[PDB]
Design a binder for this molecule. Sequence first.
Ligand SMILES: CC1(C)CCC(c2ccc(Cl)cc2)=C(CN2CCN(c3ccc(C(=O)NS(=O)(=O)c4ccc(N[C@H](CCN5CCOCC5)CSc5ccccc5)c(S(=O)(=O)C(F)(F)F)c4)cc3)CC2)C1
Length: 139
Amino acid sequence: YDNREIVMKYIHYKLSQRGYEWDASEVVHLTLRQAGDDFSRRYRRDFAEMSSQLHLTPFTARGRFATVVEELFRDGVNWGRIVAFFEFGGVMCVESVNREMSPLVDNIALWMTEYLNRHLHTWIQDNGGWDAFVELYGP
Ligand SMILES: CC1(C)CCC(c2ccc(Cl)cc2)=C(CN2CCN(c3ccc(C(=O)NS(=O)(=O)c4ccc(N[C@H](CCN5CCOCC5)CSc5ccccc5)c(S(=O)(=O)C(F)(F)F)c4)cc3)CC2)C1
């Protein structure tokens, strides 16, 4: 499955729900959206803390993203951390819009796509690909 499309559909949906029409395998997209909503409710303190402590500006966004992503996957990968990675990118995009720095969304989407293609892709494929994530979540 194309990771770039997965990132784009995911971010696009999150922003559209804030009235922001961003100028940017259906089961996979819907499943990821649901798993991410579940993650953010089940781990609300983490979600809420990250959201309020970003201190996001165009000068720091890339460094904050790199730092958090390296910390997230430090002890290895699992599907829950992959969902957390998407929700973190979503928090970054959402905060960028809230702070009137919406152009950052494009950079964020690229960094997410790159990290998936360069660092998560092998793990994902070794686990059977996104079909495995779909099965695990249900469908
Ligand atoms: C260092 C740093 C600061 C870095 C940055 C950062 C951070 C801070 C803010 C933000 Cl915003 C982002 C990141 C943190 C914060 N940290 C990040 C990691 N966090 C994790 C917490 C739990 C797991 C886990 O549990 N991982 S797991 O064991 O692999 C597993 C288990 C169950 C399910 N899904 C089930 C679904 C069951 N069905 C539902 C449908 O009805 C049928 C039954 C439950 S919902 C569900 C439950 C959990 C996850 C997703 C969905 C899935 S999953 O959905 O991915 C699936 F199923 F595999 F697909 C996978 C992995 C990591 C904890 C908090 C730390």
